[PDB]
């Protein structure tokens with residue numbers, strides 16, 4: 001059960017999350033919970049760790065900038081983090097809020113949430129499952145989601161590669177700064193597109 | 195004259211380059227020479243340094259991989275360079291061949307050639323002139339070159355930003371590895387697109 005990792009039941013957790021997140025975002029988290037279970041089954045990852053990590057990945061999405069800055073200082077995190085914003089913070093910093101609120105100490109689940117947005121050059125299969133589940137969950141309808149889903153049915157690594165390439169492409173298209181760890185992920189995984 | 199920087203006249207140089215480079219590439223170099231002069235006039239950069247740097251920027255485009263690897267070892271350059279290829283090498287390593295062949299020791303011209311492909315987080319106006327001239331020279335006809343030309347008529351910094359964003363976008367679109375120094379340039383200049 002989820003209580004093997006956190007300080008409350010799944011239902012109690014959902015009730016807490018319904019207070020923290022808008023409807024669309026909680027619906028998304030439920031979608032990632034389901035998608036992570038499916039991917040974990042397919043690729044030999046613990047389905048319970050994957051489900052929980054999926055449900056929790058965006059738990060800190062609505063923390064204020066000020067709250068994130070306080071956490072960077074309190075946990076003496078990479079000071080370069082202050083130069084970024086919610087997109088980077090909600091996973092990379094938000095894990096500390098999740099830990100405080102839920103008594104989540106499982107290193108694998110924490111890592112998968114930590115890097116769910118930006119990836120890393122080295123990712124566990126659990127990390128990859130969450131990173132991909134976030135992109136392909138059933139509520140997503142962006143053009144090309146069908147391609148992502150097809151790739152994810154066949155190769156976890158190729159799905160990471162595809163998502164990362166689309167993210168870098170899109171950020172450059174929009175003229176948004178690209179977190180350097182995102183490029184580490186991109187360069188490590190891009191060979192899978194061949 | 196060019197002899198103030200290199201060991202031969204401009205005509206002698208053109209004759210040497212016509213032996214090293216295919217026609218299309220030499221035509222390109224002549225185009226960059228002209229475009230760099232125009233940009234240097236516009237943005238207060240020495241027109242002669244810009245012209246020469248522009249003519250020379252792709253001098254090493256046809257060196258073999260083996261030749262580049264030999265240069266990395268001989269000059270004890272960043273060993274990570276061996277993980278890349280001609281796109282990175284012809285500027286970043288090719289400067290040493292240019293120096294050997296032409297007795298080019300001007301630090302500013304060398305730097306502008308060195309980073310003409312990948313940029314840097316900090317670029318001199320001369321570096322920026324070459325980086326942009328390469329992209330907008332009259333023989334180029336890629337879709338969107340008109341936009342690049344318009345931006346370059348107004349802002350050197352915005353032209354660097356635009357070119358860098360299009361390069362990152364394209365590399366991710368194609369599924370090619372992105373040299374990390376390219377991301378340094380991108381992140382440093384992307385604010386100019388606003």
Ligand SMILES: [Fe+3]
Pocket residue numbers: 057058090091116117
């Ligand atoms: Fe997220």
Ligand SMILES: [Fe+3]
Pocket residue numbers: 028032057058134
């Ligand atoms: Fe999400």
Ligand SMILES: [Fe+3]
Pocket residue numbers: 251252284285310311
């Ligand atoms: Fe070049």
Ligand SMILES: [Fe+3]
Pocket residue numbers: 222226251252328
């Ligand atoms: Fe060129």
